[PDB]
Design a protein around this ligand. Structure first.
Ligand SMILES: C[C@H](CS)C(=O)N[C@@H](C(=O)O)c1ccc(O)cc1
Ligand SMILES: [Zn+2]
Ligand SMILES: [Zn+2]
Ligand SMILES: [Zn+2]
Length: 231
């Protein structure tokens, strides 16, 4: 069963196979007095691996690369960060030093610089406007519009029907809003609807934090976000 926040010591990383050629990676971090789990994705790219998001910091991301070599044994050659927060780009320098080509949109790279977070090296083109989708190796990158952040991207794995929502999609256990500091609360439901219209075939939906589920996570997120706005 999927590892939970209490099952991962901070500094360790676990992998969970979702489908053939698709894993999530799961780490934990102490943040503002509490312990949170955090997910990213690993997607087989021929005889290489594509990474979606760091494991939230240099230590965790070094542990991620070690666990990938131990459990999978294919080299990570590219990585995409899905927004500019530390749980997505924290560890990009570890990746860069290990020879991983790190990617993000121009908006994510800009916002990371403003915030003082690590900056992915490469810029992704074609994701500037809501509804834009681009193929990137074995995934499709999709910009649904502003939500958890203005730059947030989602990732679809067509061979496996896996939708990676990142932090724009909440796990079912979360029934109140979390980090809204950089969010566009008003647009977030409309952006989630764009995802639902674009990836109706998704079987697995992976949130940025916590347990995977189905497409139900999309409505769930909309429910919680709207309830926060109306506080
Ligand atoms: C440090 C990251 C940057 S996105 C963060 O703030 N994450 C919160 C969020 O994503 O809203 C959060 C995740 C899980 C929870 O249970 C509660 C809050
Ligand atoms: Zn975030
Ligand atoms: Zn997050
Ligand atoms: Zn719900």
């Amino acid at each position: 069963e999927y590892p939970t926040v209490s099952e991962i010591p901070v500094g360790e990383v676990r992998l969970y196979q979702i489908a053939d050629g698709v894993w999530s990676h799961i780490a934990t971090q102490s943040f503002d007095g509490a312990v949170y789990p955090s997910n990213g994705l690993i997607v087989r790219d021929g005889d290489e691996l594509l990474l979606i998001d760091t494991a939230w910091g240099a230590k965790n991301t070094a542990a991620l690369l070690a666990e990938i070599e131990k459990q999978i044994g294919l080299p990570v050659t590219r990585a995409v960060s899905t927004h500019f927060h530390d749980d997505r780009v924290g560890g990009v320098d570890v990746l860069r030093a290990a020879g991983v080509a790190t990617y993000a949109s121009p908006s994510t790279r800009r916002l990371a610089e403003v915030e003082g977070n690590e900056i992915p090296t490469h810029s992704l083109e074609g994701l500037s406007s809501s509804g834009d989708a681009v193929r990137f190796g074995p995934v499709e990158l999709f910009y649904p519009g502003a939500a958890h952040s203005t730059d947030n991207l989602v990732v679809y794995v067509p061979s496996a029907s896996v939708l990676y929502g990142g932090c724009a999609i909440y796990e079912l256990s979360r029934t109140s809003a979390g980090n809204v500091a950089d969010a566009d609360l008003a647009e977030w439901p409309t952006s989630i609807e764009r995802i639902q219209q674009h990836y109706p075939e998704a079987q697995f939906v992976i949130p940025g934090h916590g347990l995977p589920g189905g497409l139900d996570l999309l409505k769930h997120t909309t429910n919680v976000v709207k309830a926060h706005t109306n506080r």
